[PDB]
Amino acid sequence: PAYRILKPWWDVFTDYISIVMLMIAVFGGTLQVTQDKMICLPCKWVTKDSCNDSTGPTGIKYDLDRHQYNYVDAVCYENRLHWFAKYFPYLVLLHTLIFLACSNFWFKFPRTSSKLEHFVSILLKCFDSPWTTRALSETGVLDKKEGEQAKALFEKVKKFRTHVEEGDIVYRLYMRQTIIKVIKFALIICYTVYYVHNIKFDVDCTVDIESLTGYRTYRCAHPLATLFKILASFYISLVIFYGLICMYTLWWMLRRSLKKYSFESIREESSYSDIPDVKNDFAFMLHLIDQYDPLYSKRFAVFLSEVSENKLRQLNLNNEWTLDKLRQRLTKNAQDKLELHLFMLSGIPDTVFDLVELEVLKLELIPDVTIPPSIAQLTGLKELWLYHTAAKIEAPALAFLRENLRALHIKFTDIKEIPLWIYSLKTLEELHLTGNLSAENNRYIVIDGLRELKRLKVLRLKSNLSKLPQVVTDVGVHLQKLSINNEGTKLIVLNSLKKMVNLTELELIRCDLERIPHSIFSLHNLQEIDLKDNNLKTIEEIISFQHLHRLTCLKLWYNHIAYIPIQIGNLTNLERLYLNRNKIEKIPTQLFYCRKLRYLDLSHNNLTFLPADIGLLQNLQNLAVTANRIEALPPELFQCRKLRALHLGNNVLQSLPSRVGELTNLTQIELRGNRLECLPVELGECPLLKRSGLVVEEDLFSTLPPEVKERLWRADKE
Amino acid sequence: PAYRILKPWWDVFTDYISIVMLMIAVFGGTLQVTQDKMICLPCKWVTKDSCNDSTGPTGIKYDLDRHQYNYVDAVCYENRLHWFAKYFPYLVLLHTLIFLACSNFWFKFPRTSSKLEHFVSILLKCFDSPWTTRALSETKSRIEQGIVDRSETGVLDKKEGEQAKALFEKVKKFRTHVEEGDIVYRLYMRQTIIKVIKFALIICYTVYYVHNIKFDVDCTVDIESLTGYRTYRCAHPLATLFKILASFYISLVIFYGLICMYTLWWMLRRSLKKYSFESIREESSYSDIPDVKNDFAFMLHLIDQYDPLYSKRFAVFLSEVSENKLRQLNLNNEWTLDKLRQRLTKNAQDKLELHLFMLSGIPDTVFDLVELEVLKLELIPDVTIPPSIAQLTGLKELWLYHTAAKIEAPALAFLRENLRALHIKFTDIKEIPLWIYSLKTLEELHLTGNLSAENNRYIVIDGLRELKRLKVLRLKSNLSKLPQVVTDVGVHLQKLSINNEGTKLIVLNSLKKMVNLTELELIRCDLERIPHSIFSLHNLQEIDLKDNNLKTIEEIISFQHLHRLTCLKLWYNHIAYIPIQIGNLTNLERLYLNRNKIEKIPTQLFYCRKLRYLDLSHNNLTFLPADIGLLQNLQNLAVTANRIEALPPELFQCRKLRALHLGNNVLQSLPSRVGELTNLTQIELRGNRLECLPVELGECPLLKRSGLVVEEDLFSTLPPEVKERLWRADKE
């Protein structure tokens, strides 16, 4: 089987010694059974209960028959022959049996037999493991299944180490076996040496049988005495060898202190400092194997180490996410940037850094990531997204990011999930925070390091804030763009916003303002204002926007704005005006004094008509009145020569005015959902219009002339 | 083979001691067979029927032959040698053989042999199954909001998953088979009791009789006619060795008896008819392992004495948590991405839909479908929303039908950022997840199921105020009064829909604050009267009052306040008549009055020239006023199930009347002006008292056979040109 490896040289020697001892026991026993004779002749002249030893010679006549001789031989054997000379083979058999019991007690004892078989099974599967030879040769692609096997093997070795290190049972069994062997060898050597001299050939008995034989004493020969003395001396030699071997084993056990196995030699040779010392009953079996072979312990150490487990995980990951699969999976975001999205992986594959074309890296739900120093290979990396993925960084990686990272996106479920090293970056221009960070009695404590971003320009917060933090006010002295998305939670300004005089784009989305704060007018460099979803109802404060001489875009959409103040005519610099999803029912004529206007979106309002002053907007380029009650478009609308789009969908339009063809810059027109009976023939004289550009019901489109329809199909096809 | 697991250490010790005792039995037996001697010499001087024991020495002459000595020694061996000395090895052989038979009966007896081999086979195949190590390795505001901690997942082979499923099934069957027997345990108990009583008997008698093995024996056998002597003194040369063997045997049996006493003490103190399993599950948290009944706890106790490792490798397969987890893995393997994509359908709103019904859980691979739009979950129990749901970028609606689902922080954040609609249907308040009030981008909430309770009403929905982006709120909960939170949150609601399914709803001045509302629905509210709070909603456009048991709808005069009221459904009521005040609502476009008790149509109804839909199905109308042709924009006119015997010719002035429904009427004959309606597309005519269809019916440019719903007897009257044209139009 496989138990030949748990036997050291000394156990093998003792096994063979016990076999030889058992052989001489059986030989002596069969002799003592089949011959076992004394031959006793009476002595006629007796001196002090001893034989006096005092025409040719004639034989002496004792007048004894065969049966009287048999009786005296039996009596003198029973009484005067020494018990050693008679029972030597049975003593030898008993001693060899109890020696074999001491040897195999731990093999037959189930409590330790289970441990030994488990240990040998695990060691066997580690020795033949394909990853062992690979890892020791390396000092590269593998099967996924074999990697799963190796991971299961690491878990198995973890369980084995947990179960065994508390044992202290196999070691105690071996120690007690060897102690018993030593004491028994000492005792048997003692008594056997003391008594081997009583195996004499010639014996004398004075057995007091004279009423049965007439003679007092007898002189007897024990023919098997010399063979038995030879066998006994051979046995004392064998027991001496057995005892020397057992004393060596006892000294080895008492010397090495095998409750602790250092294991550090291989951990230094193969450079695995994460190979700790194994404890009692786990050190011992390793020592026994080391006696058989250190190679098995070498193959076991790699599965016992922690760093090798990490390398195995990395190799499985590289097998799972190769360079080809990653490059094929590479996509582009909406920002015309090359980005890679890693979602729910055990770690960062080491092959992602061989794609030097990357610019944005997204790490979402990747547990316990360490930012490898290999990120230096990503020369062109500009944005790193850490979504529910806290990153532990090293000094080289931190130094690289301090000079190569321009935008950082952090989405966290908890304060602790925010890396603390991200603030130390100095070239960082964009910080995107997405998560609730409000705290009680320690509000705005985590992000105090925000001031350290001296190059910061874009700061977007989506953080359930109830007031603009003071640290943000300090860091805003160098900001260009601000974006706060409280998700409906009210935000308080209270004169904490005017310090960002360099701010040029301010967004207060879902901040529940309920009224435009006066602090917005103190940002004279502001160029875009986005106040989406703030429950605004009165926007008469826009008269103060004349202070902002550089205001070009106004997004007041997604509010409950009931009316457009006529004071909106004073915002002469407006080019984009977004007002959709509001309660506006009519368009004041003052709104058309903003001649520079280019984007005018008034969708999803309660409008019914367009004032004729819409022809004043020569720079109109987009017009969205989607989902309105616009009965008919005034012909003055077509005075907007460069109108490049028209969103009239979901209206109550009766007939499309025929002047639609004059819009030669018209590229996209939407008309779906209208009660439009007929289509104009002048729709066919828009050079840039295609069938995709025109949005209208197919059955209504069937009303257009075949020439116009064919021309539109030809333009849309190519 | 694999039976070594059964025997504890005392069993092995007894087996080895029995081997030793059998060895000494065979040794003593061959000694007694091959030597078996008494060496006897006559006693010349005899005192009290016994030996007296009283020019150099000379031998004593008895004048006996060798054969006379053989005879006397044979007789003295037969008679005066103690029976114990003669038959001790045979008694030892008998006792050791019966000890071995007692040990091995439960293995050789087929009734218990089959049970033992079945248990060992199943235990071995559950030891070799790899699911065990994986199971072993698997190991405030946040708690009360359905937020659960992260749990890891893996991928397992389909073949090994099926093997583990079959192994769970086989272990179930075997436990059922074994729970009733209690035969192996009884046989083992009887074997141990026999062993102990036999030990007691043999120790007692052997120790009593061992003193009769003497070397020197006196026999007075009464053979004087054959030898001339009365008494003899004999030597038994095997007596001392037999005494050594006998005392060695009593020492061995003392060891055997102490071992068996300890074994019986253990088997009585332990109470091993039931298996506890408390430590493994109390540490590793797998409480779905019930205690074990008879004949299946005894074998596990044996295993525990041998090795607890097998006990755990079996406990994992006997647990129910593990079975459900393996079921999850098998369901993951079964519902492959191709299967789910083939299962994907599109709901009425042209959205890709996945409706899961009666599954043990949400398959982990439903979240690899990037095109999924609506996820419907019905009758899926004790399920967790995994963080992998964040891959469903296009997911907009989540339907939780009788499903209480817990969520994790990543999935909760993703849904809070992405989820638009939520359908909650519950028979219990606790089945409503409490994390649904933290979805701050939610826009459309459908509450289905009774929610009100005594002394604690309208407190679970106290969290609706946190849904700051809610627009569509559907309340189908048998409300006896509109909850205060609904009034508070309705300031930004754009559509409120209530379905009391027969319960009377009292608005009681709680509806005039939702000035942003544009659609109001009160279905089966049993109002029996239009509440005056509706007319204060100056932004309303659609008002539905279905199944309110309305009788008089003269309240519609106040609808002139609503300056954008386009659709107004009053269907499924007891409305006896249409008040003439319905003409003041010139902005009406859709008007529904079907399933009512209307008998006549006022002429003032045709002052609404913006009307486009006029459905009067299932009424007692008998004629149509001539002003019906004034509504130039009417497009759908259904008068199904009425008493319209004839249609006015002015009705065909509505040239854009796309569809008609004149079925189930008493129409005597179809007017010839039916061809004037150029835009007619779908006209229903089944159920009328018509005889012949008009020829002018076929001149409609767009009407097809699909749009001409009529009986075949009437349809047979069309000219064959008309029939062929309709068939061709239906084909194309």
Q: Tell me the two tokens of residue B308.
A: 């607890």
Task: Encode burial over B216-247: b for 16+ CB neighbours within 10 A, e otherwise.
Answer: ebbbbbebeeebebbbbbbbbbbbbbbbbbbe
In contact, A534 and A582? CB cutoff 8 Å: no
Distance from C-alpha of B29 to C-alpha of B20, rounded to nearest angstrom: 14
Taking a contact as any Cβ pair under 8 Å apart, which residues of chain B between 459 and 488 contact chain A?
Answer: 466, 468-469
From residue B283, alpha-carbon distances to A486, B130, B277 in Å are: 44, 21, 11
- CB pair distance less than 8 Å for B41 and A212: yes
| Among A314, A290, A292, A310, residue whose Cα is nearest residue A302 | A310
Burial class (CB in 10 A: 0-12, 13-18, 19+), B349: exposed
Distance from C-alpha of A208 to C-alpha of A72, rounded to nearest angstrom: 10
Residue type, B676: E
Distance from C-alpha of B495 to C-alpha of B504, rounded to nearest angstrom: 20
Angle at which helices A144-164 and A110-127 pack, to 10 degrees? 150
Dihedral angle, C-alpha B327, B328, B330, B332, nearest 10 °: 160
Q: What is the DSSP letter of B290?
A: P
Burial class (CB in 10 A: 0-12, 13-18, 19+), A49: exposed
In contact, A490 and A467? CB cutoff 8 Å: no
Pick from B59, B69, B130: CB nearest A214: B59
SS3 of chain A: helix, strand, coil, percent, to 5: 45, 10, 40
Please name the residues in contact with B577: beta carbons below 8 A apart, sequence gap of 6 or more: B552, B598, B599, B600, B602
Q: What is the DSSP letter of A467?
A: B
Phi first, then psi, for residue A647 (nearest 5°) are -110, 90
Residue type, B502: G
Q: Tell me the two tokens of residue B546.
A: 């279905």
Query: Residue A90, SS3?
Result: helix
Neighbour count for residue A353 (Cβ, 10 Å): 18
Supply the DSSP string of B626-682, one letter for each residue: GGGGG-TT--EEE--SS------GGGGG-TT--EEE-TTS--SS--GGGGG-TT--E
In contact, A590 and A567? CB cutoff 8 Å: yes
Q: Could you tell me the strand order of the sheet in which B405-408 lies? A: B147-148, B405-408, B383-385
In contact, B399 and B379? CB cutoff 8 Å: no
In contact, B592 and B617? CB cutoff 8 Å: no
In contact, A332 and A338? CB cutoff 8 Å: yes
Q: What residue in A sits closest to B138 (Cα-Cα)?
A: A155
- Using left for φ > 0, alpha for ψ between -120 and 50, and beta otherwise, residue A357 falls in alpha
Query: What is the SS3 string spanning A236-254?
Result: HHHHHHHHHHHHHHHHHHH
Phi first, then psi, for residue A282 (nearest 5°) are -110, -30
Q: Which residues of A touch B40 (CB under 8 A)?
A: 67, 71
- Using left for φ > 0, alpha for ψ between -120 and 50, and beta otherwise, residue B66 falls in alpha
Q: Touching check for A439 and chain B: CB below 8 Å?
A: no
Q: Tell me the two tokens of residue A565.
A: 């103040």
Q: What residue in A sits closest to B239 (Cα-Cα)?
A: A78
In contact, A478 and A504? CB cutoff 8 Å: no
State how beta strands B383-385 and B397-401 pair: unpaired
Task: Encode burial over B617-627: b for 16+ CB neighbours within 10 A, e otherwise.
Answer: bbbebeebbeb
Per the DSSP assignment, residues forming a β-bridge with B40 are B234
| Among B539, B110, B55, B127, residue whose Cα is nearest residue B308 | B127
Length of chain A in residues, anyone?
718
Supply the DSSP string of A578-629, one letter for each residue: E--SS------GGGGG-TT--EEE--SS------GGGGG-TT--EEE--SS-
Q: Tell me the two tokens of residue A490.
A: 């009210």
Output B106-115 pairs: Cβ under 8 A, ≥24 positions apart: B106/B184, B106/B187, B106/B188, B106/B191, B107/B3, B109/B187, B111/B183, B112/B183, B112/B184, B112/B187, B115/B178, B115/B181, B115/B183, B115/B184, B115/B295
| Among A112, A91, A129, A96, residue whose Cα is nearest residue A21 | A96
Per the DSSP assignment, residues forming a β-bridge with B292 are B275
Neighbour count for residue A258 (Cβ, 10 Å): 21
Q: Tell me the two tokens of residue B339.
A: 């299967």
Query: What is the SS3 string spanning B353-370?
Result: EEEEECCCCCCHHHHHCC
Distance from C-alpha of A695 to C-alpha of B40, rounded to nearest angstrom: 136
List alpha helices for B396-477, DSSP H.
409-418
Q: Tell me the two tokens of residue B678.
A: 């150029």
In contact, A521 and A500? CB cutoff 8 Å: no
Q: Touching check for A364 and chain B: CB below 8 Å?
A: yes
Q: Tell me the two tokens of residue A335.
A: 């920002």
Taking a contact as any Cβ pair under 8 Å apart, which residues of chain A between 678 and 707 contact chain B?
Answer: none
- CB pair distance less than 8 Å for A152 and B136: no
Taking a contact as any Cβ pair under 8 Å apart, which residues of chain A between 194 and 213 contact chain B?
Answer: 210-213
Gyration radius from chain B CA atoms = 51
Minimum distance, in Å, between the CA of residue A385 and any CA atom of chain B: 15
| Among B597, B602, B643, B648, residue whose Cα is nearest residue B622 | B643
Residue type, B359: L
State how beta strands B39-42 and B232-235 pair: antiparallel
Map tokens 């059955």 to a residue.
A699
Pick from B215, B240, B440: CB nearest A488: B440
Residue type, B1: P
| Among A336, A389, A347, A331, residue whose Cα is nearest residue A364 | A389
Distance from C-alpha of B358 to C-alpha of B556, rounded to nearest angstrom: 47
Neighbour count for residue A501 (Cβ, 10 Å): 12
- CB pair distance less than 8 Å for B53 and A216: no
Per the DSSP assignment, residues forming a β-bridge with A363 are A342, A386
Query: What is the SS3 string spanning A278-308?
Result: ECCCCHHHHHHHHHHCHHHHHHHHHHHCCHH
Output B245-248 pairs: Cβ under 8 A, ≥24 positions apart: B245/B24, B245/B27, B245/B28, B245/B88, B245/B89, B246/B88, B246/B206, B246/B210, B246/B213, B247/B210, B248/B24
Half-sphere exposure of residue B408: CA atoms within 13 angstroms, side-chain side: 16
Query: Residue A316, SS3?
Result: helix
Distance from C-alpha of A502 to C-alpha of A481, rounded to nearest angstrom: 9
Distance from C-alpha of B73 to C-alpha of B68, rounded to nearest angstrom: 9
Q: What residue in B sits closest to A158 (Cα-Cα)?
A: B137
Query: What is the SS3 string spanning B687-722?
Result: CCCCCCCCHHHHHCCCCCCCCEECCHHHHCCCCHHH
Q: What residue in A sits closest to B309 (Cα-Cα)?
A: A114
Point out residues after which chain B has a gap (C–N over 2.5 Å). 54, 139
Mutate to test the interface with A, among B69, B155, B245, B732 (most CBs of A within 10 A): B69
From residue B607, alpha-carbon distances to A572, A629, B653 in Å are: 47, 21, 16
Minimum distance, in Å, between the CA of residue B440 and any CA atom of chain A: 6
Distance from C-alpha of A686 to C-alpha of A291, rounded to nearest angstrom: 94
Per the DSSP assignment, residues forming a β-bridge with B346 are B352
Measured between alpha carbons, how far apart are the two ends of chain B, in Å? 79
Supply the DSSP string of A35-56, one letter for each residue: T---EEEE-SSBSSSSB-----
Taking a contact as any Cβ pair under 8 Å apart, which residues of chain B between 118 and 147 contact chain A?
Answer: 130, 133-134, 136-137
Distance from C-alpha of B527 to C-alpha of B544, rounded to nearest angstrom: 12
Distance from C-alpha of B663 to C-alpha of B665, rounded to nearest angstrom: 5
| Among A23, A153, A176, residue whose Cα is nearest residue A89 | A23
Query: Residue B96, SS3?
Result: helix
Phi first, then psi, for residue A485 (nearest 5°) are -125, 90
Q: Touching check for A413 and chain B: CB below 8 Å?
A: yes
In contact, B289 and B324? CB cutoff 8 Å: no
Q: What residue in A sits closest to B136 (Cα-Cα)?
A: A159
Q: Tell me the two tokens of residue A341.
A: 């999205």
Please name the residues in contact with A637: beta carbons below 8 A apart, sequence gap of 6 or more: A610, A614, A615, A623, A657
Q: Tell me the two tokens of residue B55.
A: 């020019």
- Using left for φ > 0, alpha for ψ between -120 and 50, and beta otherwise, residue A263 falls in left
Q: What is the DSSP letter of B584?
A: G
In contact, A89 and A32? CB cutoff 8 Å: yes
In contact, B378 and B355? CB cutoff 8 Å: yes
Q: Tell me the two tokens of residue A407.
A: 């935008």
Phi first, then psi, for residue A684 (nearest 5°) are -85, 0
Point out residues after which chain A has a gap (C–N over 2.5 Å). 54, 139
Give me the total of CB pairs closer than 8 Å, taking one residue from chain A and one from chain B: 137
Distance from C-alpha of A623 to C-alpha of A642, rounded to nearest angstrom: 11
Distance from C-alpha of A25 to C-alpha of B5, rounded to nearest angstrom: 34
Distance from C-alpha of A229 to C-alpha of A234, rounded to nearest angstrom: 8
| Among A363, A368, A370, A375, residue whose Cα is nearest residue A403 | A375
Dihedral angle, C-alpha A605, A611, A613, A618, nearest 10 °: 50
Distance from C-alpha of B191 to C-alpha of B187, rounded to nearest angstrom: 6
In contact, A304 and A161? CB cutoff 8 Å: yes
Distance from C-alpha of B419 to C-alpha of B416, rounded to nearest angstrom: 6
Query: How many degrees, rounded to 5, is the angle at CA B118 between CA B112 and CA B120?
Result: 100
Supply the DSSP string of B62-95, one letter for each residue: ----HHHHHHHHHHHHHHHS-HHHHHHHHHHHHH
- CB pair distance less than 8 Å for A111 and B413: no
Distance from C-alpha of B637 to C-alpha of A573, rounded to nearest angstrom: 53
Angle at which helices A294-304 and A144-164 pack, to 10 degrees? 100
Please name the residues in contact with A221: beta carbons below 8 A apart, sequence gap of 6 or more: A38, A39, A40, A201, A202, A203
| Among B326, B289, B309, residue whose Cα is nearest residue B131 | B326
- CB pair distance less than 8 Å for A67 and B469: no
Mutate to test the interface with A, among B7, B51, B60, B141 (most CBs of A within 10 A): B60
Pick from A114, A344, A435: CB nearest B307: A114
Q: Tell me the two tokens of residue A429.
A: 């221009």
Minimum distance, in Å, between the CA of residue A513 and any CA atom of chain B: 13
In contact, B418 and B440? CB cutoff 8 Å: no
Q: Tell me the two tokens of residue B642.
A: 């009425």
Per the DSSP assignment, residues forming a β-bridge with A392 are A370
Distance from C-alpha of B419 to C-alpha of B467, rounded to nearest angstrom: 12
Please name the residues in contact with A274: beta carbons below 8 A apart, sequence gap of 6 or more: A267, A305, A306, A307
Query: Residue B551, SS3?
Result: coil
Resolution value in angstroms: 3.1
- CB pair distance less than 8 Å for B564 and A606: yes
Distance from C-alpha of A584 to C-alpha of A609, rounded to nearest angstrom: 12
Neighbour count for residue B447 (Cβ, 10 Å): 22
Minimum distance, in Å, between the CA of residue A75 and any CA atom of chain B: 7
Pick from B64, B235, B388: CB nearest A71: B235
Length of chain B in residues, anyone?
732
Solving technique for this entry?
A: cryo-EM
